[PDB]
């Protein structure tokens, strides 16, 4: 413990956040936040459970070096620097916060589980510093580029549902994957997941592939770009505006001009031991 208090101090003065202090108070069974705590008591803390507690700062968290379990979903945090030197951290859960500065975890080499769904996160390149991660929940954010996931090869469970990924090539080698969740993205081609022979649970529903605008024509023909794990086109389930599929082409008849056309696809897949349904909608803008 580099960080530490030298003399008995009131909780209200260690932990600035009105709420977080009150969390400590309850944790160490104290009576009031005004009550004193010694560094001794601070070291006996292994886990903090404080979901939806209106926490806006975890200031004072640094004096808890033995803490290994953090449950902090449903708070207003946006700064995790107070966490950087808690060497013994393993599980850390921060959904529904606004922490986008994941570069603070660079030295949590014991961190195994990291949940950060619903934070507004675009850049996750900070993750390059935690190869040992076994479980990662990056669901519901603004992530487009997952190049960095190339290095987290110890993950047995990855979740990226509900973002903006269209390119999953960086996932090809993560063979140690068993649980993969990819719904609500822009995935067009599952050639990347070919080798994941360890999977047990996979999800791929409700994709949202969008195409670059095209001059509308009275007898439009849009090529099928959706591709299965082996590379084969996936026959469309339903086509908008009375369209047809004369493989590998999608065809429309547009006697009048319309902003766009589209087709839903549905393709049961199986990877390793996992049974999923690759499904979604391709959208074709027109001008």
């Amino acid at each position: 413990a580099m960080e530490t208090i030298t003399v008995p101090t009131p909780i209200k003065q260690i932990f600035s956040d009105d709420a977080f202090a009150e969390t400590i108070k309850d944790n160490l069974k104290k009576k009031s936040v005004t009550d004193a705590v010694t560094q001794n008591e601070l070291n006996s803390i292994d886990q903090i459970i404080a979901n939806n507690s209106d926490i806006k700062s975890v200031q004072g968290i640094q004096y808890l070096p033995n803490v290994t379990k953090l449950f902090l979903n449903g708070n207003k945090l946006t700064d995790i620097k107070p966490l950087a030197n808690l060497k013994n951290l393993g599980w850390l859960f921060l959904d529904e916060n606004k922490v986008k500065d994941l570069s603070s975890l660079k030295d949590l080499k014991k961190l195994k589980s990291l949940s950060l769904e619903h934070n507004g996160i675009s850049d996750i390149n900070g993750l390059v510093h935690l190869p040992q991660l076994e479980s990662l929940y990056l669901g519901n954010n603004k992530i487009t580029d997952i190049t960095v996931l190339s290095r987290l090869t110890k993950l047995d469970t990855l979740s990226l549902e509900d973002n903006q990924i269209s390119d999953i090539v960086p996932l090809a080698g993560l063979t140690k994957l068993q649980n993969l969740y990819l719904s609500k993205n822009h995935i067009s081609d599952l050639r990347a997941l070919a080798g994941l022979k360890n999977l047990d649970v996979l999800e791929l529903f409700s994709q949202e592939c969008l195409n670059k605008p095209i001059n509308h024509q009275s007898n439009l023909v849009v090529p099928n770009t959706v591709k299965n794990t082996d590379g084969s086109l996936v026959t469309p389930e339903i086509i908008s505006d009375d369209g047809d599929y004369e493989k590998p082409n999608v065809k429309w008849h547009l006697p009048e001009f319309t902003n766009e056309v589209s087709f839903i696809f549905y393709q049961p897949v199986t990877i390793g031991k996992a049974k999923a349904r690759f499904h979604g909608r391709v959208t074709q803008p027109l001008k």
């Binding site: 449950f71 389930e237 009375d242």
Partner: protein, 546 residues
């Protein structure tokens, strides 16, 4: 609890018309009052003779085109209809009946009928499907228009009807399950033989259009609801409406798009009777019409025989998959309605034993019915009404035998949920939360600990107690709330098991919100389980050595 009305005899049909409910019952026609289902008026269609018979209602059709009135057809005098004219803002009952080669004023079969009604071009037209065997004409699929004289119907040409060859009249029959008009066509849903002299049975959908009394684009197509590969071949009920935004995106439908929610059952061997095994899927009309407008087909067999306007048929069934992923695999669903709240599509269903229940319908996966109870022991009828509008929260009229009940579209409170998870699985518009030891509404909370997001785990045993050193035995962890609530659903995504110092590899594909399965090895250890929200304990598992 909720408004309900009991009649003297079975209820066959229900229509709603400007705040007044109309019941078609055996020997009576009731006029309840929408607000509280209170009986305001009635008419004894009575026991008619000809050697006493009962007058089972076969149709109700209101029409205010000419004058405000209600047409009704019974099953006694060769399916003859009668006018009921209202006296102003509201007894004066007429009748329709006039060289006997045909009989138009004979509309309805006592073997089962379905009646559509649409004023196409200055005249009211009745589109009717009749089941039948041997006896002197009623048509099986007819379109007889009513004259502005209002005293009788009239067929136009030979094409005004399509029937069954006398040689196959009794041999193989056709039950008309439901009928509806949409996209400028008319649709009939049937259960009939797969092929002439075939032992199994079908569900088909019929389409045609009308010109004077056209029936000009006639076509039959088979419909199958299969499970992931078991087939549910007998349509039991079928309702038609719009999809909620969620459901739509998944099936590629637009908000105004019409959809066919059909409940199928797995039939008995070489029969048309149903077993207690049910399924459901949705048929988008345009999707259907998409196939009706392409080109593998024979010539309507029960019409022509094995050998201008062609009446045709497809020889391979369109098929969709169960939206309940086998949820109702061992129950007989006998009634379906469909309404939208939010982005959600909710179906209120009915068992062959009297169980109304409401269920979020999604292409992603089944949800747990937020309503689920016992209307009377009598099976629920597929005859239903759904009045729901903005600034309002709507209701469903449901018929069980002699009884009809008005059931709210917001379900029936939270009090009935067994645990934090089910309680929190309920659809937003039910407004439930967990309050430590009970599920209930917001402002009715004891301790300030109401939550719509948080559930904590709890263990209640493990199998087995001990386990050999290196042995990767399967641990079965029995308990509660092992799952996490993300988006609006629960799953074991973030769920973890710890065997003191080492992790415990869960197989998720085999685990539930109540049961955990995972391989263990490589004492007297404590098992810690986290669902993502918090943790729980079990200090029993030992790494023994035989």
């Amino acid at each position: 609890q909720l408004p309900n009305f009991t009649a003297e005899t079975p209820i066959q049909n229900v229509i709603l018309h400007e705040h007044h409910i109309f019941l078609g019952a055996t020997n009576y026609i009731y006029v309840l009052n929408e607000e509280d289902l209170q009986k305001v008026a009635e008419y004894k269609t009575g026991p008619v003779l000809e050697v006493w018979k009962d007058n089972i209602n076969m149709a109700l059709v209101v029409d205010t085109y000419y004058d405000d009135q209600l047409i009704s057809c019974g099953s006694v005098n060769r399916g003859t209809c009668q006018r009921h004219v209202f006296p102003h803002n509201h007894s004066e009952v007429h009748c329709i009946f006039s060289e006997p080669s045909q009989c138009p004023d004979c509309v309805v079969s006592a073997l089962g009928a379905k009646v559509l009604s649409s004023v196409k071009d200055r005249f009211i037209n009745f589109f009717v499907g009749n089941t039948i065997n041997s006896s002197y004409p009623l048509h099986s699929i007819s379109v007889r228009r009513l004259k502005e004289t209002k005293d009788g119907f009239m067929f136009l040409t030979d094409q005004s009807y399509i029937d069954v060859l006398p040689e196959f009249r009794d041999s193989y029959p056709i039950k008309y399950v439901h009928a509806f008009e949409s996209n400028n066509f008319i649709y009939f849903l049937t259960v009939q033989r797969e092929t002439l002299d075939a032992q199994t049975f079908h569900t088909r959908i019929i389409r045609f259009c009308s010109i004077n009394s056209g029936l000009h684009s006639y076509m039959e197509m088979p419909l199958e609801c299969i499970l992931t590969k078991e087939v549910f071949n007998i349509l039991q009920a079928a309702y038609v409406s719009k999809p909620g935004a969620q459901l739509a995106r998944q099936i590629g439908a637009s908000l105004n798009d019409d959809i066919l929610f059909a409940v199928f059952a797995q039939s008995k061997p070489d029969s048309a009777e149903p077993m207690d095994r049910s399924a459901m899927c949705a048929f988008p009309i345009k999707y259907v019409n998409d196939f009706f407008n392409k080109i593998n087909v024979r010539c309507l067999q029960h019409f022509y025989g094995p050998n201008d306007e062609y009446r045709t048929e497809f020889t391979t069934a369109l098929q969709r998959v169960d939206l309940f992923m086998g949820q109702f695999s061992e129950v007989l669903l006998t009634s379906i309605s469909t309404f939208i709240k939010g982005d959600l599509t909710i179906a209120n269903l009915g068992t062959s034993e009297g169980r109304f229940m409401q269920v979020v319908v999604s292409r992603s996966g089944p949800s747990t019915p937020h309503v689920n109870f016992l209307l009377d022991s009598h099976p629920v009828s597929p005859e239903v009404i759904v009045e729901h509008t903005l600034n309002q929260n709507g209701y469903t009229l449901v018929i069980t035998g002699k009884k009809i009940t008005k059931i709210p579209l917001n379900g029936l409170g939270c009090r009935h949920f067994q645990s934090c998870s089910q309680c929190l699985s309920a659809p937003p518009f039910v407004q439930c939360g967990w309050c430590h030891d009970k599920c209930v509404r917001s402002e009715e909370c004891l301790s300030g600990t109401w939550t719509q997001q948080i559930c904590l785990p709890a263990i209640y045993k493990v199998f087995p107690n001990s386990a050999p050193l290196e042995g990767g035995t399967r641990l079965t962890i029995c308990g509660w709330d092992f799952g996490f609530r993300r988006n609006n659903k629960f799953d074991l995504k973030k769920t973890r098991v710890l065997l003191g110092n080492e992790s415990c590899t869960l197989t998720l594909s085999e685990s539930t919100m109540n049961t955990l399965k995972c391989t263990v090895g490589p004492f007297n250890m404590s098992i810690i389980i986290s669902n993502g929200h918090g943790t729980t304990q079990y200090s029993t598992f030992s790494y023994v050595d035989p």
